[PDB]
């Protein structure tokens, strides 16, 4: 019943808070919306350095509301030259029916929450994902992410269509890291990633021997 207005959140570290809109899309019955944050290991945090308020709220049928994300003074202990990962969680509590022999389903939405320090603040539509490097290795590619940001890779194929629709196990690269993925060899690799807005652009790569970088 209860829904969230985005599939990832970016927290701009130049500010102290932001809000996410939520909705009870069920027009018949009230639902409760519980909110909380988890760290990079999906372990629940409560006192900081990011908090979600209110932790619980009743949404009347069809009601629209918000959840606010705020930082605490301990946010300054996070690195200021790369993103830190959190997860934002929105779990509903459906109205209890006292109906005999029923299974009731309660949706939980869990999205990535990227804390993005002021020193790496981005402009609308800025692309850093074109800095990815692909290295051919046995059975696949070692992908390098030299950037300060998390990068979520959702496709890799020999054409734009294969990047968009081919079978590929999503992988997310931490800032300044590398990860090997299983893959066939592609003469001109195309790679798809998910951007801040939930869109899925495709990048075209050219290879020199085993190393591949985005077509200039």
């Amino acid at each position: 019943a209860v829904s969230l207005d985005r599939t990832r959140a970016v927290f701009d570290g130049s500010e102290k808070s932001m809000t996410l809109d939520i909705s009870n899309d069920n027009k018949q019955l009230p639902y409760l919306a519980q909110a909380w944050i988890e760290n990079e290991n999906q372990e629940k945090i409560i006192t900081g350095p990011v908090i979600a308020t209110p932790p619980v709220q009743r949404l009347e049928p069809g009601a629209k509301s918000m959840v606010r994300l705020s930082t605490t003074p301990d946010i300054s202990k996070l690195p200021q030259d790369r993103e830190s990962l959190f997860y934002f969680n929105l779990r509903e509590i459906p109205p209890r029916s006292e109906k005999a022999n029923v299974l009731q389903i309660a949706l939980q939405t869990k999205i990535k929450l990227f804390y993005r320090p002021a020193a790496i603040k981005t402009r609308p539509n800025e692309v850093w994902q074109d800095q990815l490097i692909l290295n051919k290795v046995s059975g696949g590619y070692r992908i390098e992410n030299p950037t300060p940001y998390y990068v979520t890779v959702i496709g890799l194929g020999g054409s734009e269509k294969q990047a968009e629709e081919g079978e590929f196990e999503t992988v997310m690269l931490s800032p300044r890291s590398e990860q090997t993925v299983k893959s066939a060899n592609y003469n001109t690799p195309y790679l798809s990633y998910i951007n801040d807005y939930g869109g899925r652009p495709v990048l075209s790569f050219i290879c020199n021997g085993s190393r591949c970088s985005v077509k200039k």
Partner: protein, 147 residues
């Protein structure tokens, strides 16, 4: 419009046929259970709306852009969920459209779909304890993790 403010993919809202998001499981299936079978199957459909779930070549679930998990208290075995209420001797089992059985807290495998809908099938099973009919039930979490 060439010029406009930021527009983002919303998270999916879950919709069921029943306003309470409940599936009626039926009377405790004692006679089936004693014969050594599971009780009758009950289908339920979770429609995932507002998130442009389908794309030209696939959809968020099949392509692993979302990952889904059934959350609950595990029953007698990994393949089973515990039930609350007065009944005894029973657990719940959930399966996807290819017969993959959900395990509490374990992500469901990504498969191609057969509808904006995810379709599951539940059934009541034995849990090893003495069967005692009565009412039962459970609240299960359906957790959608966004890539």
């Amino acid at each position: 419009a060439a010029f406009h403010g930021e527009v983002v993919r919303p998270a999916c809202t879950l919709a069921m046929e029943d306003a309470w998001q409940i599936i009626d499981m039926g009377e405790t299936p004692v006679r089936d259970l004693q014969n050594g079978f599971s009780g009758p199957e009950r289908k339920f459909s979770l429609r995932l709306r507002n998130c442009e779930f389908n794309s030209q070549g696939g959809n968020l679930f099949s392509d692993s852009r979302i990952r889904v998990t059934f959350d609950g208290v595990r029953g007698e075995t990994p393949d089973k969920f515990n039930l609350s209420g007065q009944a005894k001797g029973i657990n719940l089992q959930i399966a996807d459209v290819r017969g993959n059985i959900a395990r509490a807290g374990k992500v469901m495998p990504a498969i191609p779909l057969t509808e904006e809908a995810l379709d599951y099938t539940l059934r009541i099973v034995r849990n090893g304890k003495k069967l005692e009919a009565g009412n039962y039930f459970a609240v299960l979490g359906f957790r959608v993790d966004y890539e």
